[PDB]
Homo-oligomer: 462 residues x 4
Amino acid sequence: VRIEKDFLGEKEIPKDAYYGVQTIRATENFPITGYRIHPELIKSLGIVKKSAALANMEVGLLDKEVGQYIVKAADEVIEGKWNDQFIVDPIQGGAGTSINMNANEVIANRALELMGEEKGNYSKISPNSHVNMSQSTNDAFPTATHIAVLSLLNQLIETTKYMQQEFMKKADEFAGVIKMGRTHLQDAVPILLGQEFEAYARVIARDIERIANTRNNLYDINMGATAVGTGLNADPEYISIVTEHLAKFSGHPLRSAQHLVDATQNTDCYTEVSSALKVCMINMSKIANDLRLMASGPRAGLSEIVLPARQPGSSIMPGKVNPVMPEVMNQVAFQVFGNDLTITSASEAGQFELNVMEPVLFFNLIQSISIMTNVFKSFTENCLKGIKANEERMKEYVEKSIGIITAINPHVGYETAAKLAREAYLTGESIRELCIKYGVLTEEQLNEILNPYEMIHPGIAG
Amino acid sequence: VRIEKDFLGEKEIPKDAYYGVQTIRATENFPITGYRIHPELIKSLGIVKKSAALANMEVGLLDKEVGQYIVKAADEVIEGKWNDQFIVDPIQGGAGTSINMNANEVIANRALELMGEEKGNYSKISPNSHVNMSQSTNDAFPTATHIAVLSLLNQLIETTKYMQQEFMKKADEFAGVIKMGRTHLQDAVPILLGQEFEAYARVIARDIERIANTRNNLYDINMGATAVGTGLNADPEYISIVTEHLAKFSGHPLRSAQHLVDATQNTDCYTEVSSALKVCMINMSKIANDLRLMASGPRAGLSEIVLPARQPGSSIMPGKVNPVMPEVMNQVAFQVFGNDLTITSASEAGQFELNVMEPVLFFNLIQSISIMTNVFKSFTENCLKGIKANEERMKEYVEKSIGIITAINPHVGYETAAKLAREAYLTGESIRELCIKYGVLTEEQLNEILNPYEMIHPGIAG
Amino acid sequence: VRIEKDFLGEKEIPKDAYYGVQTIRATENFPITGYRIHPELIKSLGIVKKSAALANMEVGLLDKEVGQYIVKAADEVIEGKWNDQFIVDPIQGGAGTSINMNANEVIANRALELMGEEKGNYSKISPNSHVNMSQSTNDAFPTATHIAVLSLLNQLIETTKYMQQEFMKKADEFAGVIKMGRTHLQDAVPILLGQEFEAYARVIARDIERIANTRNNLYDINMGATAVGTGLNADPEYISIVTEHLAKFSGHPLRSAQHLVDATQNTDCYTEVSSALKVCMINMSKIANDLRLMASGPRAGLSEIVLPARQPGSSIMPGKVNPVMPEVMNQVAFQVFGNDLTITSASEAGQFELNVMEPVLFFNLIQSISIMTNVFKSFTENCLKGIKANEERMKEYVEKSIGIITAINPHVGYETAAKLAREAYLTGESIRELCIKYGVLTEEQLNEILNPYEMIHPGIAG
Amino acid sequence: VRIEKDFLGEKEIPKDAYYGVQTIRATENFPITGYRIHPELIKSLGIVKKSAALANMEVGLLDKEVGQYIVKAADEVIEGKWNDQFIVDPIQGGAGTSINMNANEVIANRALELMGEEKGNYSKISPNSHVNMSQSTNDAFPTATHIAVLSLLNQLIETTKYMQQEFMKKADEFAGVIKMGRTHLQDAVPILLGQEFEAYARVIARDIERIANTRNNLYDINMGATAVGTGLNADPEYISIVTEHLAKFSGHPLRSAQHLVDATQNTDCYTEVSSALKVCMINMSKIANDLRLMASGPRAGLSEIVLPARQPGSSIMPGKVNPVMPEVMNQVAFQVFGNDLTITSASEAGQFELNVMEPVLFFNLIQSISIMTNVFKSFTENCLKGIKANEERMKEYVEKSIGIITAINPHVGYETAAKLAREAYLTGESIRELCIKYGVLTEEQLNEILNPYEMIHPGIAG
């Protein structure tokens, strides 16, 4: 057992635990979801605390003896050796003060334990006077988040660049596959499966550029802003030195905002990212819809493609294999949509020099980024790479179609092409047959026209 | 021309115009959408002003000689003889005052004309002191909306009940049209077309319930709440009398809110209505998606049903008949989804004794009730009623499906059920033509098993 | 170690684990959030499985020896003795098939272990042939959910009835507290703190009725619907018997849907609930905003009320105590908003006889219900019950105000009341002083007018 | 009158009317909102039709004698001389065909009039075969939108840059107005007014960036994609020429999409624009909330600033000046939030080679760009420019605050800082009048410490 002085009374803390009274209070105040902050935020908090201790020792504001152990402690945190000590809820009041304190108390007691001391003795190492030195809950929390979101964002970018490329391999793999293009779900003119699959790769790439670009306004941190961001009593040399430590230790081109009051009360950089991730899932969701449509059947559906099986199929029903992968892609799209509304709401709920709604906002931003990376990973591996086509099925879909007339029209004139089209539609005979029966094009003269490639690309009539 | 002085300066009001400086200034401050308030809101304003004029005269607050004219004028506003005079932007600040004043000025001036006086002579009939006597923007405006929304609501209910019944007709009409059910867009077991249509009729019936029941909370008005909702200086006999007058002329069971303060600051009833509309449109959209899918084709799609052609088909390409009506349905569903977010947002933005964001809220709420009633009518008349079925196409779907085997299993043992199926899965041989060309059930017997009704209904295995 | 036959190969399962190959596959296919389904869904799955085993034994479809142990196993599940065996992700493809199987395999192996057998021997007890007998993933999953959502919903209703009542105790506690009502955030006329607090209780109560009422369409289950809901090969006696078991064991007035195809493909009942919960948080969020405004200060803010302290305050800043509780209330409101968009999207993404987007939809519905219950619990305990008022502070706010003139106006006429009001506004002297200086009302004659109660309620001028 | 035959029957087109059966039928099928397409879309349609007419003539596809007239007519449509003739509902099915045909008919008939022919004589000038020659609804409509949105976008940018600069002016103008910062709406440390205004100017500057950069993806048009996007039968010289004509007359750096299929089915660029607008409005709304708060009062509120009166204040109650402009700002922000959900939803509803839900999407997108530009102008001209400050009120706020002590701590030791503060917390004695009436810093010295600039800026403790 143990006991720590809290204005709300003396509380007991497990002798094995590293969090202090403050964290417990947070646990009692906001027991909402039961979730634990993402390990990357934890890692980033470690980085933020380590970089601050350092700068503080350099400007000489932190005793070099204590601030020496604090570092090795923050490093252990960074290495992910204390993700269980962070028990506060992602959704909490206090605009993040509890997330800051949970880290301050864990880094403080470990630092105390490390230099042979009593964990609870905040006189030797104060999580609030040493660990949280030269920093406020309004600059440490956001900075750690910017770092977390940035690290996380890069991981998504690469997982999407991979997916996007695998989408191209399929575009070429099917670059010769001919089929029927549908507009309004109504049969139109011929199109190549590869043209649709490249279409997918192109929107995805466009998604990568947009997501990637949201990182810029995320690179500006407000470390050094005091409470309101006016830097009251803040050492300009601390700011310059800590900013650089964060950058090197976080591997990000971090920068110090030109205006701290602005970088303190505004949250537009967070929404910018959510908005990009939303646009990405909008597209991915649509692509996931086309995938389920082309996979429909096998008998009473479109049956254009075949997705690998990922979940056992009913025995009495051979052929029924649900596109479970593309489906889970649709659901993540919906989640991201929902998170973007939650994020939108938190952002505008900001008041004056501080937006206290940041905690629920960050929980969603980081969630979206996470779940997207994960579905992308498994969706491409467990579905995309192994997509096969039913060329034959689609080939004939083009034969029994009417739209194919557009290709033929130029070689027969509108007058006859229309007659051929109408009749074939009413009687049910392929347009190919009507050209021979009515004698207007020979079997050979027809294939030289029904050229899959030349038929799906712009060009003269010859 | 005419000149009306304003604390902002002199504005030249058109000679033939019935509005005044108040209305003009509003046009200047809020040139947002350029739209006009729904004529049902205009009519409602006329009722509110009339019900107030009579009450004020009965309680001796308003000169019966002037009041008499005001009532006659308000009566013309109720008959929609002056909708042109209402020019303020549905989206405006001031929490509705511009809208209220537009009605106060128009009625005030039209009244002066009736009693042979110069329009704009607010000394005889002040729009503020006479037409707006004993009321506040905070109670007149919201009460008008309560009446308008209720009226539009009842219409939506009629048009929806009509539509719901037309769905039932289709359910009966197709009560025997067998087709192939799908789950995950994957072939499943057989199902009756008419069953899907009753599935729609039911959810819609259920919408009618939810929507209609949201009327109750609107019945409570806050007329006579004055500014905050304290009724400060308001005469209980005025309230009593005015509430009774509103119910009588509006046609709704209006009730004077038990807690006028609660009724003056809470907007939970509007979010309740929007909630019910959004849900309805969700159902309606899923249904439209189904329709466009069942109409896809002809050659390369489902082709289960035929929707009546409204848009002229491809000039010379037959067969392509886009499902425009179900499409315009889907879009309205999207509008209502966005409208509900606007409403949610405007509702939560409330502060203390008054939610000043009501105009955008009411504008969206009314718009939903309006556009929904409008497509519901157009969709049932120009699509729903004329939907025809491709009985044969769906018939063969059930026949050549490797899934109808679930309906035959009990009669041929779970052993022979794997051979007659898994074989029909490769050779593609009809599951029926296989029973014959193998021996297990005689044709006349095989039809009592694959019967359209008992095959799509609950029954003991064998 | 162990090993189970899966079409995707032979997989290893920890000898201690109760889930089988299928669950593992689910774990590999959809590793999205890392979350575990809510223990109540687990409990409900238990109930659903237990009730099915029973009915199956009664209709004699399940061997009474095996189905005997399965029950005691499902009961152990119901008692929450295996919430760790359910490892699948809330967000999964397959419209919930994996959640069904995770329960089927855990209930199967425990049942096997219980009758002294080998867990992996699906020949003795098949999670797919015994446990999942007379049921499909399209009727068991939703039913368990309806039951889960219903149980959960009641808990919220009571936690809100409590909060709502505590809101009234404060209404009366402050029934005498006078203050300044604000519309547009601009000073208006006087109002009682108790009138605002009752206003809160009234919207909340209205929230309880709406939330409570959403339970009705949730009472209809579709147990007995086969795959598509046509009940193909389903024993009508099984349906009647299982439905009743569910009802008694779940404590809910469960009913068997009149139309199973409808109850299978429609999801409108889920959105109905989300929509009610959304409306509730809209209101709660607004109430939480007023609370933060009234708590503002202590020096440069409104300072109307004082919320108990829940998180340590800056030492150099005595008086600064952030409304962390009302803030976490605002964030949950945003979450629920987001979940309602995710829920809306999943509902309309339904296709034909089955909506496969139900998993992400249920994850949100259950989350919303949960987090709301939790914030409600702690918000009332850690904030609501202990709200104190600064009567003095507010009393004078009414003295230095102008709006107070409205109360006085009747006893002095518009001519003089306006002069008194203007001057006091320009010079800065209270209206009370101007009445004595200008001699128009004596100190006594003024207090008999500035009666807090008579001033905040409708009435004549005498 | 006039009679025009339609596959639906004979419709009597008005004699003075320039539209035809196509347009009329659309009015019948879609009587949804009753609105008219934004005149910028109309103008764009005229440009597209002109750029196509010239290209078709150059490549010899269109009779130069007829084409000549078509161009002149399209030229009148570009000059907005016929906006009245465009009567189709912005919300329509058919994926834009009605809108496209409305432009094809109007231009076709106005051309026939110019060359002395009977209007409706589509044998001379067929709206479908001449005005719509070499194009498809699928490429004409989206390209027009690309041009319209781009044009409106550039205007929004001008008006926003203007507004952003006006904010800067206020930032400079108040560069020295000290006030009391707030976080959690709780008193904090001092901050400069002008700092909050530059905080706004910066986020808005940042919006200008994000918004403008979304123009790039719109630059790529798909003109000449025909139905699906295969360009089947389209002449590369036509495309080349038409794209160049569009850029020239539109004024934008239009580029012919590299993958016409990708450009014909993806809508990710519109969601990208809406995303940027939504974010901007989030910032703008937070700012409006701040404004209404800083204008609250006068007597019972913050009263930090004075907004110019636009709505006539309480007839006889002085002091009450509602912040209507910031309010109408908040509402527009809510509209754009809903519009973004509609757009998100319409975007994801895409299918295969065409997203048929574009009309509702474009309607909302354009509406956002329009209403935003409109309030941005009105708000800066009727509010922002005339914002005055209550320098004294804010001055005393800083003076009587128990928080200014953080700015004096370094000079009086962390020991005397607890006595001079915690005492001023109860007696309410000025933190300054306490330093004097206690001895620690001389008046002339106490002012170099509590200086408005160095007190709100980063600096070494002492």
